[PDB]
Design a protein around this nucleic acid. Structure first.
Ligand SMILES: Nc1ncnc2c1ncn2[C@@H]1O[C@H](COP(=O)(O)OP(=O)(O)OP(O)(O)=S)[C@@H](O)[C@H]1O
Ligand SMILES: Nc1ncnc2c1ncn2[C@@H]1O[C@H](COP(=O)(O)OP(=O)(O)OP(O)(O)=S)[C@@H](O)[C@H]1O
Ligand SMILES: Nc1ncnc2c1ncn2[C@@H]1O[C@H](COP(=O)(O)OP(=O)(O)OP(O)(O)=S)[C@@H](O)[C@H]1O
Ligand SMILES: Nc1ncnc2c1ncn2[C@@H]1O[C@H](COP(=O)(O)OP(=O)(O)O)[C@@H](O)[C@H]1O
Ligand SMILES: [Mg+2]
Ligand SMILES: [Mg+2]
Ligand SMILES: [Mg+2]
Lengths: 354, 258, 318, 330, 343
DNA sequence: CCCCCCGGCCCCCCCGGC
């Protein structure tokens, strides 16, 4: 049935179990939500930013926020192209991901958000204070992927129409967000859960799911391998239980994603052989990874941090590798074709290592 | 609704006047004074000048307390003027230092009122008084004949050359597919004086004009049955249509001979 | 005053092939064609202001005589030359019945044919072939590569080269003798130097100098025609010390009103053609100039950016 | 538009006659000689912003025709549509038709022609030539690289230089007389220094200064007023900052920079430009110093143009200057 | 169903403090006197020039222009006299050539007797192009002659954050106004007034710390103050807000973690630095704040020589420039720390 | 009352340095 990562997700602020200070701050924000400013939640991926945003929305409006529906909205470009945007909406809030339309995301800000903001709330949404709600929440997922034009278009909308809409933007890093937008939002840091908290959550899941654990050390190993990613930890616990007949032993191996294995193989290939033929072969692996929806930035990060973990490399090699990684990460951020920058980075690393 | 109030008993008159020269100019300054409304406008290419005059005798009622200037885009004015019907009285209304002009279409029999407002534009242009000129040749002919001649010759070429000599007027066109020449002579019919071709020639005249401008000028034939053409070798050609009270004049610059 | 003096470029425009200077072999071939006739389809290409349109018109006149009015169809960039025009007007002209001297044919002149669309050029292909017995086509262009290969295959090629200083001096002296212009040798040398092989520019500069100063000497000539900025940029890029390059930039370009974008574009163009410098060094200089140009296009058109570009160029050569 | 006194000073003082255009004596004299003798050629006016090209051509048109010049000249600019279709129809009929009012020649003024498409410029080539007997063309430009070589070959070029000091001083004196204002000598020097040869900047800054004075009648504009209204660093501030950077330690230099910038809220870019101007006159022993200074300061200016952290940028400026000046010893 | 419409005052009373305390008149602007005085003198001079407002975020440009328009035309005549276009509206060359030009050419709206008796009512309209730095160069060039030809009835205001993005002709045509950064020395009064009107109780120096953390942005300071007030009210303990709470809410790294990072850098071991940074990024600290704190610590430390500071300044500048382009924070921070450790 | 003609939005494809 539903995966344990989704079956046991908290649906309230009182159901949270890690980062109690963040829970207290969110509860303080929800005490008097009428003057709630725009929110920007930033933190490591897979820590529970979306879960906490949904919990805050539930506290402000009630459980009805969890009754979700999906619709489709049409848009027309200057070239007469027709684009479709999938909108997830509830009786109290609207969720959008403008980056789905790429460079056309600006239109989503210009038309859909403008239309929503230029409409006041007339439905009698009685609140805890006894008076009806006056604004509708908008969740912009993956705000870091928005183009600078869309962010610029977002500037005046949040100010002129602040009485009808309040924006909650969830991001993993604030570097791509332009300063004017960051100035208009309340920034909320979302630290990743500690290993002990992850182990507690996994043990609770095990107890509820009737899983035979030989020891509690397996949960600690799973938490340590997740690097603070709770979603990955839960999905790996589920994966490790379906390969051992729902019984986990102390010798159960940790399962890594296939793309991680491919990247480690590429790292070993680069380390062992430094040649033009090796670069040509690595180009095929890079193209293969990029053709299966593996982002280039993730590939670069994983390759850089796997090369730095090789025990046969000296300090100078690692310093050169990290410098080249920074330079080519900037190039990727300022470029279009990622394969070019990745191949350049691999060639420079091969040159430095040899 | 006090300063300027002018009533056309029939709204078709003003619409027809605008129809005559809306395709030649876009921005027009109408100056309304105690003696009526006067306007001039030069086209984008500075080749054609349109001068419209409407006297107080063409209005059922007219009251202009002080001189006023109204800058209007003829496209919007024409759009507004095609809303009223031919059986409604049309009132132009303006106030002191106005920013907009009010058009009132009234149907007393049905007790129906229509109000439109057109925003005025700040157009900086001076009323360039057209000094009177002694033209070498002056002719008058039915508007329909001139319109047909212009339409016929426009197909064969983009330029039409007019010759005025002793007791003969010639329109000539020469293009790629062929050439055409229409010759007319002075003539008067006592039974039907409206079809008479009248000519007064002091010196022979030979002037070439663009067909595109003549095709736009002939659109004023719906305001009068006869058209007057005054031509001179050292002055723009004047095409005049006489209204009941005022007039509509087109000054067209001849093409350089070379 | 409401009167205009006719420019000497028009008052003294050649009317016969014998009055055209430069490209002696091509002009002789044109005269031979005008003599025998049987004019073939031709495309005349060259740099601006060397006598292409003049040559085409002179040939058409010398070939058709009193029939020029009916036997010539001239179209240029200022006239509509779409596919519809080619399929209706040019076709009608080609199919027109016109009795001409024994060995003469109708002429369709397409000036500045390089600006035509590919559709019109494709449409002209069969029109030229089916009516070659009565009509011939003469194209005049600056970039022959913009004419589709099928059209080039059906036409002869006449490429015009730069006019030598001797031809420019000859024509300028003829005009001076026909205008009683007082001149000095250095003035004519300066006029030729600034003309850079362009007869139209030379004649215009001479007329402007005569009308503005009277005496055609070096001083007056340079008061009308400013020193070519590409040469100043070349001097700036070839300077030995960084201080000299910065002085050239500040005194000769920046304080004279030249824009930063113009300076960087001229620097790129000059560097691309600096054969004296090795190709690799020119490539590095081009990379630096491109970085500076990208910075300028983003809005930072400051003198500091140009100074930094010069410093980087000097560092490359050290 | 009630009165000319309601207009901005940049538009109120627009020259109406060729005698009111200052700092372009050569061009004005040449064009006047051409017009008087009836030998006006096709003209190109190339120059930087605010030098008097549009004003000069408008004055020339008014002199040739008179008060009704607007109805006798075809003026087009970037704000209007100037595609190939407009060239083929509007300009072509204007050039091939006689004047309605007088019997003189016709003038077409294509201002900001650098914004015109290549197709329109190519189409204008034969229009300029065929109708040269009765039509003349004027092309105004700020960037010559946007003009096709064919169009340039058909026009005689005139370069508008940055306004000299004397012309700016004379115009300032005229404005002071008109406005009943008093300007100090050092104030005039500072105003001219910050103008960079642009008259519009001078007029705007003077208008701002007048609004700053509590009593414009009995008060005089001093250098302090000019520096405060524009929010620009004073020469003393630049000298002190450079001296602290060049002779004091890191802590003292940082404190001095922050104190100087916080007293009047100075901008880092202005300080960098002033320090670059000051250092341009320095006699350095090694070219490496100049190369490092120029490259690092250009990089810092480019980074500032995109925002960034101001404190880090100031520290970078200090460190770059200190490191560059270390090459003057060995 | 339907809800009864709210009053303007009631609606404003429940808005975020940034919108609630937006300046209403030109006198409420805090630290822009050098330009506010010039703008105020135009209410009597009636010769407002073309304006180009530029400055860092949260300095009061939009507030200043809105207050100026409201004072010039009043609540009723403002709508017909103002045309506002921002980054959320289409602003191509076609729009400039048709919409902006058509509005500029229109005759000024006729003032009413009440407006003439109570407000200056200058004889021109205003076009406000907010975020003008986002417009293309061709569109900006299309405005050059429109600005000058119709200046008699129309005035232009261009508001931008990056002045370099405005083409030189437009900047020359516009009188330039630079909005200065709002720090603890020029904006303390406004923040104190806001806190007093909101009954916010804080210890001495809390407002100064908030303004220092804001780094020139008053909007950020007001938002942080509102967050602190909300937290204090939720706790309901009656105690004063403290600087540590403000730093925690602002995302400032604790000083102890900064000292640990400095010690790791001093050690110089690559593996230990990598491990510590991997653990550090799990807390979600923003790289920009870490870089700023490292700059503050190193540049103002007397235990370092001149060459070390010269090199670290350039290293920090390069890292900040790279981060400003939207790059991965982990890699850049690790590279910066490794480079510093090898100085 | 209805057919033919022919100007006017809409649409879609192709360049873009010199
Ligand atoms: N070879 C030449 N001999 C004499 N005069 C010449 C010659 N070439 C050009 N000229 C003069 O320059 C004027 C312009 O020359 P054209 O041939 O019409 O221009 P062009 O060579 O067609 O340049 P493009 O490519 O059309 S812009 C002529 O009218 C002559 O006055
Ligand atoms: N030579 C000058 N003498 C006096 N005032 C001048 C002069 N040049 C410019 N000005 C002033 O600056 C204003 C603008 O001058 P313009 O000639 O329109 O600018 P410009 O030279 O056209 O700059 P561009 O190229 O259009 S950006 C004029 O109205 C004068 O007030
Ligand atoms: N000078 C100031 N005086 C008083 N409050 C100010 C000032 N500057 C900013 N604020 C506050 O910050 C809020 C936002 O100010 P804005 O003027 O909209 O920001 P901004 O200057 O436009 O920044 P950008 O350029 O649009 S990102 C206002 O509503 C005020 O609450
Ligand atoms: N407080 C919590 N208690 C239990 N599980 C949680 C908690 N917070 C997050 N999770 C789990 O972590 C997973 C990933 O969280 P997610 O909402 O993706 O965080 P982010 O939005 O930062 O990626 C979710 O599937 C959820 O089940
Ligand atoms: Mg030609
Ligand atoms: Mg100009
Ligand atoms: Mg703003």
């Amino acid at each position: 049935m539903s995966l344990w990562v989704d079956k046991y997700r908290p649906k309230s602020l009182n159901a949270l179990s890690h980062n109690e200070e963040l829970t207290n701050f969110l509860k303080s924000l929800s005490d008097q939500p009428r003057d709630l400013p725009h929110l920007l939640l930033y933190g490591p991926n897979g820590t529970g930013k979306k879960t906490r945003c949904m919990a805050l929305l539930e506290s402000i409006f009630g459980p009805g926020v969890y009754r979700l529906k999906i619709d489709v909205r049409q848009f027309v470009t200057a070239s007469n192209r027709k684009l479709e945007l999938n909108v997830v909406s509830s009786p109290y809030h609207l969720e959008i991901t403008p980056s789905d339309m790429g460079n056309n995301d600006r239109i989503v800000i210009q038309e859909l958000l403008k239309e929503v903001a230029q409409m006041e709330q007339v439905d009698f949404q009685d609140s805890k204070d006894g008076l009806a709600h006056r604004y509708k929440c908008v969740i912009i997922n993956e705000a870091n992927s928005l183009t600078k034009d869309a962010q610029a278009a977002l500037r005046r909308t949040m100010e002129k129409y602040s009485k009808n809409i309040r924006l909650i933007m969830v991001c993993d890093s604030m570097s791509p967000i332009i300063a004017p937008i960051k100035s208009r939002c309340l920034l909320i840091r979302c630290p990743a859960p500690s290993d002990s908290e992850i182990s507690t959550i996994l043990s609770d899941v095990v107890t509820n799911e009737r899983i035979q654990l030989e020891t509690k050390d397996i949960l600690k190993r799973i938490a340590q391998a997740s690097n603070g990613n709770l979603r990955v930890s839960l999905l790996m616990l589920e994966s490790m239980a379906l390969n051992n007949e729902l019984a986990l032993k102390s010798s159960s191996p940790i399962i890594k994603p296939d793309w991680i294995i491919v990247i480690h193989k590429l790292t070993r290939k680069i380390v062992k052989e430094r040649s033009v033929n090796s670069l040509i072969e690595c180009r095929a692996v890079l193209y293969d990874l990029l053709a299966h929806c593996i982002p280039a930035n993730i590939i670069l990060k994983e390759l850089t941090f796997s090369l730095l973990d090789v025990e046969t490399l000296n300090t100078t090699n690692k310093s050169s590798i990290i410098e080249y990684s920074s330079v080519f990460d900037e190039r990727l951020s300022l470029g279009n074709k990622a394969i070019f920058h990745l191949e350049g980075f691999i060639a420079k690393v091969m040159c430095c290592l040899d | 609704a006090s300063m300027l109030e002018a009533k056309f008993e029939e709204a078709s008159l003003f619409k027809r006047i605008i129809d005559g020269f809306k395709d030649c100019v876009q921005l027009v300054n109408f100056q309304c004074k105690e003696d009526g409304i006067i306007a001039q406008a030069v086209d984008d290419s500075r080749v054609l000048l349109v001068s419209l005059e409407i006297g107080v005798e063409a209005f059922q009622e007219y009251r202009c307390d002080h001189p006023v200037t109204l800058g209007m885009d003829l496209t919007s004015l024409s759009k507004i003027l095609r809303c009223g019907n031919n059986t409604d009285t049309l009132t132009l209304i303006a106030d002191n230092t106005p920013d907009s002009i009010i058009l009132l279409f009234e149907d007393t029999k049905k007790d129906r009122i229509a109000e439109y407002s057109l925003k005025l534009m700040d157009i900086d242009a001076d009323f360039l008084k057209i000094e009177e000129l002694q033209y070498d040749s002056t002719l008058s002919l039915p508007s329909s004949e001139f319109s047909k001649i212009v339409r016929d010759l426009s197909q064969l070429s983009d330029s039409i050359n007019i010759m005025i000599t002793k007791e003969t007027i010639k329109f000539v066109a020469d293009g790629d597919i062929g050439s055409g020449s229409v010759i007319i002579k002075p003539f008067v019919d006592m039974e039907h004086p409206e079809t008479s071709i009248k000519l007064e020639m002091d010196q022979p005249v030979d002037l070439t004009f663009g067909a595109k401008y003549l095709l736009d000028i002939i659109k004023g034939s719906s305001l009068s049955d006869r058209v007057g053409i005054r031509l001179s070798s050292e002055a723009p050609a004047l095409f005049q249509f006489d209204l009941k009270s005022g007039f509509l004049q087109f000054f067209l610059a001849p093409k350089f001979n070379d | 005053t409401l009167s205009l003096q006719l420019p000497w470029v028009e008052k003294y425009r050649p009317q016969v092939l014998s009055d055209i200077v430069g490209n002696k072999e091509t002009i002789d071939r044109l005269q031979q064609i005008a003599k025998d006739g049987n004019m073939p389809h031709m495309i005349i290409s060259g740099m601006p202001g060397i006598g292409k349109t003049t040559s085409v018109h002179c040939l058409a006149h010398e070939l058709l005589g009193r029939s020029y009015a009916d036997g010539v169809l001239e179209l240029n960039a200022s006239d509509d030359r779409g596919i519809d025009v080619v399929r209706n007007q040019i076709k009608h002209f080609a199919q027109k019945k016109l009795h001409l001297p024994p060995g003469k044919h109708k002429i369709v002149i397409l000036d500045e044919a390089d600006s035509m669309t590919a559709g019109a050029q494709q449409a002209l292909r069969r029109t030229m072939e089916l009516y070659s017995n009565s009509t011939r086509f003469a194209f005049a262009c600056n970039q022959s590569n913009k004419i589709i290969e099928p059209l080039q295959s059906r036409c002869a090629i006449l490429r015009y080269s730069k006019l030598s200083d001797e031809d420019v001096l000859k024509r300028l002296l003829q005009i001076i003798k026909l205008e009683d212009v007082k001149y000095t040798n250095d003035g004519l040398e300066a006029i030729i130097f600034t003309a850079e092989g362009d007869m139209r520019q030379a004649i215009n500069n001479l007329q402007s100098t005569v009308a503005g100063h009277g005496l055609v000497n070096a001083d007056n000539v340079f008061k009308i025609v400013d020193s070519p900025h590409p040469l100043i940029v070349k001097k700036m890029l070839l300077a030995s010390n960084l201080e000299d390059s910065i002085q050239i930039l500040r005194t000769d370009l920046w304080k004279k009103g030249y824009s930063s974008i113009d300076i960087v574009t001229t620097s790129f163009r000059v560097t691309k053609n600096l054969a004296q410098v090795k190709e690799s060094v020119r490539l590095e200089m081009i990379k630096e100039i491109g970085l500076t140009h990208m910075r300028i296009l983003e809005g930072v058109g400051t003198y500091l950016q140009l100074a930094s570009m010069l410093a980087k160029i000097h560092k490359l050569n050290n | 538009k009630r009165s000319k006194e309601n207009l901005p000073w940049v538009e109120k003082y627009r020259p109406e006659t060729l005698d009111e255009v200052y700092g372009q004596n050569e061009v004005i004299t040449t064009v006047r000689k051409f017009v008087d003798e009836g030998k006006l050629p096709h003209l190109l006016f190339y120059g930087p912003p605010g030098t008097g090209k549009t004003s000069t051509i408008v004055a020339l048109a008014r002199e040739i025709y008179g008060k009704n010049y607007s109805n006798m000249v075809l003026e087009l600019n970037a704000s209007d549509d100037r595609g190939i279709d407009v060239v083929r129809n509007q300009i072509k009929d204007f050039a091939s038709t006689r004047q309605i009012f007088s019997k003189g020649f016709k003038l077409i003024i294509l201002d900001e022609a650098d914004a015109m498409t290549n197709a329109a410029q190519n189409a204008l080539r034969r229009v300029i030539e065929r109708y040269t007997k009765n039509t003349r063309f004027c092309v105004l430009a700020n960037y010559a690289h946007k003009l096709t070589p064919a169009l340039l070959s058909r026009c005689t070029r005139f370069r508008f230089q940055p306004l000299p000091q004397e012309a700016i001083e004379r115009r300032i004196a005229n404005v002071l007389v008109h406005e009943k204002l008093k300007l100090s000598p050092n104030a005039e020097k500072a105003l001219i220094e910050l103008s960079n040869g642009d008259m519009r900047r001078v007029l705007n800054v003077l208008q701002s200064c007048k609004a700053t004075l509590d009593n414009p009648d009995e008060d005089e504009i001093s250098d302090d007023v000019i520096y405060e209204c524009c929010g620009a660093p004073r020469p003393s501030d630049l000298k002190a900052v450079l001296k602290s950077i060049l002779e004091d330690d890191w802590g003292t230099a940082h404190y001095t920079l922050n104190k100087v910038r916080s007293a009047k809220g100075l901008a880092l870019i202005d300080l960098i430009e002033g320090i670059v101007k000051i250092l341009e006159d320095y006699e350095l022993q090694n070219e490496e110093t100049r190369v490092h200074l120029l490259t690092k300061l250009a990089d810092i200016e480019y980074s500032i143009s995109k925002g960034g952290n101001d404190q880090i940028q100031g520290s970078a400026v200090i460190g770059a200057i200190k490191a560059s000046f270390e090459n003057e010893t060995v | 169903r339907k809800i009864s419409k709210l009053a303007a005052e009631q609606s404003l009373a429940q808005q975020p403090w940034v919108e609630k305390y937006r300046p209403k008149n030109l006198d409420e602007v805090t630290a822009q006197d050098h330009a506010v005085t010039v703008l105020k003198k135009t209410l009597k001079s009636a010769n407002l020039p073309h304006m180009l407002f530029y400055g860092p975020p949260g300095t009061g440009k939009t507030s200043t222009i809105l207050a100026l328009t409201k004072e010039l035309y009043g609540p009723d005549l403002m709508k017909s006299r103002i045309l506002e276009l921002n980054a959320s509206d289409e602003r191509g060359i076609s729009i400039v050539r048709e919409k902006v030009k058509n509005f500029a050419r229109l005759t000024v709206s006729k003032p009413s007797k009440h407006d003439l008796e109570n407000y200056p009512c200058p004889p021109y309209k205003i076009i406000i192009l907010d975020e003008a730095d986002s417009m293309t160069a061709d569109a900006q060039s299309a405005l050059r002659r429109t600005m000058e030809t119709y200046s008699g009835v129309t005035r232009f205001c261009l508001i931008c954050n990056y002045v370099t993005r405005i083409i030189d002709p437009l900047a020359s045509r516009c009188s330039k106004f630079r909005f200065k950064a709002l720090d603890a020395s020029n904006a303390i009064d406004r923040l104190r007034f806001i806190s007093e009107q909101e009954n916010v109780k804080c210890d001495d120096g809390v407002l100064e710390r908030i303004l220092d953390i804001s780094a020139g942005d008053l909007r950020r300071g007001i938002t942080l103050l509102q967050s602190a007030s909300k937290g204090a009210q939720y706790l309901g303990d009656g105690k004063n807000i403290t600087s540590t709470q403000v730093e925690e809410l602002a995302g400032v790294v604790p000083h102890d973690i900064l000292i640990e990072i400095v010690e790791k850098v001093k050690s110089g071991d690559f593996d230990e630095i990598k491990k510590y940074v991997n653990t550090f990024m799990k807390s979600g600290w923003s790289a920009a704040s870490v870089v700023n704190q490292l700059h503050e610590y190193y540049i103002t430390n007397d235990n370092f020589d001149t060459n070390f500071k010269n090199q670290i300044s350039w290293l920090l500048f390069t890292t900040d420039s790279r981060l400003n382009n939207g790059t991965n924070e982990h890699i850049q921070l690790l590279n910066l720390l490794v480079k510093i450790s090898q100085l």
